[PDB]
Design a binder for these strands. Structure first.
Ligand code: ZN
Lengths: 171, 406, 49, 46, 240, 121, 126
RNA sequence: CAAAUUAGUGACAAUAAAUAACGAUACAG
RNA sequence: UUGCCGUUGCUAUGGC
């Protein structure tokens, strides 16, 4: 990642305040990392617009870029134009992470409940338990985010607090 | 294995001995059969009963042998998803599957269980729950000449089992709606179809990889293709499969399509748009509520709300040249696939099955050049998943057996 | 570091109700009334030029 | 009870009948007949 | 629910405030003794004996104009003797309140295009005689140019993307010079690809291009997300 | 013009039914006619789907007047059976409603379907 | 959408930056540049020394607004129409207009600095 | 102010996580 | 040939 140009202006501070509060982020490094690679993405798409129609670079790298952006999921299926890559922005990228997605699918009650579910390993996309919150789920892994079968919020055996309370109430 | 049984035009069609043995079970749901290398069959219903039949008395109707009826007694005393280890079904058994060797039948439904019953006594030998809340099983298929079961569960999941070891092999993920149907042959490949994502996937199960096949018919380009000189349109939901051989399969859709797909082409090779007709439009005495026939006819909008029958059962005889389609048009259809394997074509109809066809499969007899088969088809008056079905037009809950010859 | 930004964003969006008027989600139940007063002298609308 | 929920059955059938009757332009009687048959079947079931 | 309030005249003529422990925007009732959309009423006994006259609570979550009034608009042009051309009289919800603000000596022309709302408009305009219901498309003012003459304010609660053209056509036909133009702009129904401030700026630019000088805009935010009322006057010569 | 006028063609119908199924999974769908009119007069609804072939038609034609009053898009799907099957319940439904939610993972899809049926309407 | 004024155009031509391409590689987004009629009046009043600047402002890619007031004071017009609406970027190089615009909140400010455009109060530039 | 090597010691803050999540009740203005 | 019930056949159908 890389720090911004003027990192301490008040619009940037209220921006990062709204982003970290609305998406449950821990520090500025999440925003700065995802915005750095978004800057690379649309700095490339700017050059793909500054070259002309029927350029080989524009044709092939343009449909390649919009198809892998659609498959990451930040771009919808119908807007297959290259100016929407310029209209893309940072919260379109961090709505795709797993903490945001767990909360939006409703397995958690807030983004903080989603973050602690993910870091306590109750969430598995597909086959594998994912355990970091900033995961960038894709458009095919969007619908298999569910509770892990190794976890008491799935169907598994209940954890140590529940079983110790059950044992002490059996005593 | 390619298509080595080229016999589509060979056998007779129009004079089958069709016996519709009506049974007293509300909404039969599945049919499982068996042949060694006496033949038994299995049915199961929405009334929570499994029923064993003998079928080997080929020239006459099948014979009831044994009930196995779950009920409200089998509701677990926990409501907890991993102590679901009871011995009977308390809700909506959807699918049966007989073993290729015939020691067991294995069944399951909306009670998210797999109960494996012995054949000789219809007794529950083992219970395997699917360990989560939405884990309702919707289709079961053994791979042929084996002891390995492929169940398709509504968690967008496909579970695999070894039945004689009472073990689960592999859970494999990747559909996008509920995996409404499954199909397998002797290879360790499998072919599943999820309902509304309009894709059929086939799974290399040891590699745990897949090939996806989407649909993609559009009424814009299709009506332009007809406009170069017409009631046909897009697609609702791919519903049923059967793997014909190890390079091709066939899919039954929600808009009455039957499609033929290869292992080497994403888009389908062949379509057949209307396969069982379009439904009778709702009557003018049951659409509007006005007095005059002119306004009650204006409330039909012409042809805009005629909906096609959807194929709710499809069965390809393995490696053969002929498959059978069934819905609530009353008449099963028999189609043969051409020898160049790029098209199929309607041979004939089997018109003695009034109701929804919740299952089709065939039973073989005769030698390499002279053959006769009995086509079993479970007939209900209600779709095998939800109700949704009005205008029950003379239906009965039975087993439509047909005896086809030559 | 996470709980601090959880609780300085809750403070910020409680201060935002003071400066603007925030769309809370529409009419909850029966329309009870304005619950806080109606000023007939104040006009909080942006005049042009 | 049964007497308490026949009121609810008759309520939602009566709302259905009033919708038919208002938004049809020159109404018939046949759907009021069918809903009367339905509610008498429901009360005779109890 | 059975409580007692004090009625007090607002700054705006023809509308009132009922102070209790929650105060209500309130209008006089032109058809006393019934409610039109289920709002609550207030019956005062004003002093032959005193007569029971009554008042109707204007609900800001069911009226963009009441949301504008109690957010604070410096000048409505809907006044107690005027003629208002209501465009998009989608039912009799706000047209009844505009009608009895305008009073018995003024006229509200309620233009609506759909037909079941038109049937309810005619049955409401029976008991409110100062409503002329006009069932016609506002995109063609010539189709009802014979029924309306020389209005004083236009109110536009249409929710179509060709809003500014509809407002301009109806104003050029029937509005008089330095008359009122009250617009309820819904950003999402104009277009949703741009933000709300972009579409409000474009609509205000369209109004001054059709020579309606905007005086005032209000976002009306606690009652509607991404709405606006723009109050302008029809200048007709010299926005400068 | 019939009574059930703004009917959708087949591509729009399948787009509508796919987002109906996803909202039903995400608990954002209120299904049935009187639940739909309840959520419509409450104001938590983004668009209403009526099926244009139930056994009366005025039984759900009461809802376009409500949608017109509150400026909500309404669209007619030509199959109550397919609408119930998309809703995920074991019966045909004749009307359904997409409730508003901003912690909703399908908001872009719902907004795209709203734009399509509003340019239709 | 970016409101231009006269010294921004003059500094663009003095630094050899294209208007729409300089805006695009400054913001990495698609820009719509707007010349108000008062900015255009000011460029025309600048005389026949500034013919190059006037007929570079006459560009079909640069859209143009219609201000409705007397006089041609572009700083007043830009300040009023930006504090009315808050959907505008202001591209300017006047020190006084830069101080006005960066004192009113929520308004990003663009300016020719060095050999390309810079942007300050827009918090999403990378 | 990193004298140990004869798979291990001998970091250059470079790297993704945590230091809590969800409820109930009471009392204030 | 079945949960009832009807025609039944001395086997096929049709209403819930
Ligand atoms: Zn100007």
């Amino acid at each position: 990642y890389s720090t911004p140009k003027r990192p301490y202006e008040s619009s940037r501070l209220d921006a990062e305040l709204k982003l970290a509060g609305e998406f449950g982020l821990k520090n500025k490094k999440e925003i700065y990392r995802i915005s750095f690679q978004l800057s690379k993405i649309r700095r490339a798409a700017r050059d793909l617009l500054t070259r002309d129609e029927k350029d080989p670079k524009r044709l092939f790298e343009g449909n390649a870029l919009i198809r892998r952006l659609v498959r990451v999921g930040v771009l919808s299926e119908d807007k297959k134009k290259l100016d929407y890559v310029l209209a893309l922005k940072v919260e379109d990228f961090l709505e795709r992470r797993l903490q945001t997605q767990v909360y939006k699918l409703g397995l958690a009650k807030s983004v903080h409940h989603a973050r602690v579910l993910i870091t306590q390993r109750h969430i598995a996309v597909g086959k594998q338990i994912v355990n970091i919150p900033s995961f960038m789920v894709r458009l095919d892994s969007e619908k298999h985010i569910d509770f892990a079968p190794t976890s008491p919020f799935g169907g598994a055996r209940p954890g140590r607090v529940a079983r110790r309370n059950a044992a002490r109430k059996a005593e | 294995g390619r298509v080595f049984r080229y016999f589509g035009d060979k056998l007779l069609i129009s004079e089958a001995k069709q016996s519709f043995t009506r049974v007293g079970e509300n909404n039969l749901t599945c049919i499982s059969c068996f042949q060694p290398v006496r033949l038994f069959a299995y049915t199961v219903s929405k009334d929570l009963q499994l029923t064993k039949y003998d079928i080997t008395d080929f020239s006459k109707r099948p014979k009831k042998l044994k009930y196995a009826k779950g009920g409200a007694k089998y509701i677990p005393t926990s409501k907890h998803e991993y102590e679901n280890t009871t011995e009977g079904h308390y809700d909506e058994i959807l699918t049966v599957a007989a073993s290729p060797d015939g020691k067991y039948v294995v069944t399951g439904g909306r009670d998210r269980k797999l109960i494996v019953w012995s054949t000789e006594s219809l007794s529950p030998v083992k219970v395997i729950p699917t360990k989560d809340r939405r884990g309702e099983v919707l289709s079961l298929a053994f791979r042929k000449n084996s002891d390995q079961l492929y169940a398709s569960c509504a968690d967008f999941k496909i579970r695999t089992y070894s039945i004689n070891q009472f073990s689960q092999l592999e859970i494999l993920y990747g559909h996008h709606d509920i995996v409404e149907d499954i199909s397998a042959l002797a290879m360790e490949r499998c072919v599943t179809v999820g309902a509304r994502d309009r894709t059929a996937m086939l799974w290399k199960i040891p590699d745990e990889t897949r090939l996806t096949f989407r649909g993609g018919d559009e009424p814009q380009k299709l009506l332009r293709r007809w406009m170069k000189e017409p009631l046909f349109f897009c697609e609702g939901s791919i519903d049923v499969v059967s793997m014909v051989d190890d390079f091709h399969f066939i899919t039954g859709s929600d808009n009455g399509n039957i499609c033929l797909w290869s292992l080497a082409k994403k888009k389908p090779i062949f379509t057949e748009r209307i396969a069982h007709g379009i439904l009778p439009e709702p009557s003018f005495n049951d659409i509007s509520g006005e007095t005059d026939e002119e306004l009650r006819k204006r409330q039909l909008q012409g042809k805009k709300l005629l909906q096609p029958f959807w194929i709710t059962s499809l069965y390809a005889i393995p490696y053969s040249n002929v498959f059978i389609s069934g819905s609530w048009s009353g008449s099963l259809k028999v189609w043969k696939i051409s020898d160049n394997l790029r098209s199929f074509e309607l041979l004939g109809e089997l018109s003695g099955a009034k109701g929804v066809v919740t299952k089709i499969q065939v039973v073989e007899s005769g030698k390499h050049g002279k053959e006769k088969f009995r086509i079993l088809a479970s007939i209900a008056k209600e779709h095998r998943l939800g109700r949704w079905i009005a205008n029950v037009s003379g239906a009965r809950n039975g087993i439509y057996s047909a005896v086809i010859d030559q | 570091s996470r709980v601090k930004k959880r609780k300085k964003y809750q403070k910020a969006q409680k201060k935002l109700k003071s400066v603007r008027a925030v769309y809370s989600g529409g009419q909850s139940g029966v329309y009870e009334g304005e619950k806080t007063g109606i000023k007939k002298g104040l006009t909080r609308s942006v005049k042009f030029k | 009870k049964n007497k308490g929920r026949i009121s609810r059955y008759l309520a939602n059938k009566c709302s259905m009948a009033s919708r038919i009757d208002n938004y049809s332009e020159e109404p018939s009687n046949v759907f009021g007949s069918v809903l009367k048959k339905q509610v008498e079947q429901r009360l005779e079931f109890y | 629910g059975g409580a007692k309030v004090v009625i007090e005249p607002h700054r705006h003529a023809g509308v009132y405030i009922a102070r209790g422990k929650e105060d209500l925007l309130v209008t006089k009732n032109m058809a006393p003794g019934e409610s039109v959309y289920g709002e609550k009423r207030i019956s005062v006994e004003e002093p032959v004996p005193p007569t029971k006259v009554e008042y109707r609570v204007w609900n800001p979550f069911r009226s963009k104009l009441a949301a504008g009034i109690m957010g604070g608009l410096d000048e409505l042009f809907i006044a107690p003797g005027k003629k208002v051309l209501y465009l998009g009289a989608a039912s009799g919800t706000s047209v009844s309140h505009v009608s009895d603000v305008v009073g018995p000596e003024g006229v509200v022309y309620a233009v609506e295009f759909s037909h079941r709302p038109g049937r309810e408009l005619i049955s409401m305009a029976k008991k409110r005689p100062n409503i002329i219901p006009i069932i016609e498309d506002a995109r063609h003012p010539q189709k009802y140019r014979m029924l309306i003459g020389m209005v004083d304010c236009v109110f536009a609660d249409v929710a179509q993307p060709d809003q500014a053209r509809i407002i301009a056509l109806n104003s050029h036909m029937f509005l008089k010079d330095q008359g009122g133009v009250v617009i309820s702009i819904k950003a999402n129904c104009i277009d949703s690809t741009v933000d709300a401030e972009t579409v409000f700026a474009r609509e205000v630019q369209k109004l001054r291009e059709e020579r309606i000088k905007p005086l005032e805009q209000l976002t009306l935010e606690p009652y509607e997300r991404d709405h606006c009322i723009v109050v302008g006057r029809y200048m007709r010569s010299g926005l400068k | 013009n019939p009574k059930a006028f703004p009917l959708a063609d087949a591509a729009l119908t399948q787009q509508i039914l796919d987002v109906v199924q996803q909202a039903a999974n995400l608990r954002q769908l209120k299904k049935g006619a009187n639940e739909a009119t309840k959520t419509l007069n409450r104001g938590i609804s983004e668009f209403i789907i009526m099926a244009a072939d139930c056994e009366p038609i005025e039984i759900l034609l009461h809802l376009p007047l409500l949608c017109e009053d509150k400026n909500v898009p309404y669209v007619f799907v030509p199959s109550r059976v397919a609408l119930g099957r998309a809703c995920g319940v074991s019966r045909p439904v004749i009307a359904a409603s997409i409730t508003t939610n901003d912690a909703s993972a399908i908001k872009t899809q719902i907004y795209a379907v709203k734009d399509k049926i509003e340019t239709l309407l | 959408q970016v409101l231009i004024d006269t010294n921004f155009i003059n500094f663009s031509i003095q630094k050899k930056v294209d208007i729409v391409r300089g805006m695009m590689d400054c913001l990495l987004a698609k820009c719509n540049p707007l010349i108000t009629d008062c900015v255009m009046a000011e460029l025309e009043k600048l005389g026949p020394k500034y013919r190059i600047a006037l007929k570079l402002a006459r560009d079909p890619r640069i859209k143009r607004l219609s201000c409705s007031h007397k006089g041609t004071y572009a700083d007043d017009c830009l300040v009023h129409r930006v504090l009315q609406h808050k959907c505008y970027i202001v591209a300017t190089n006047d020190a006084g207009l830069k101080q006005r615009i960066r004192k009113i909140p929520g308004i990003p400010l663009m300016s020719v600095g060095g050999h390309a455009y810079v942007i300050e109060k827009l918090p999403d530039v990378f």
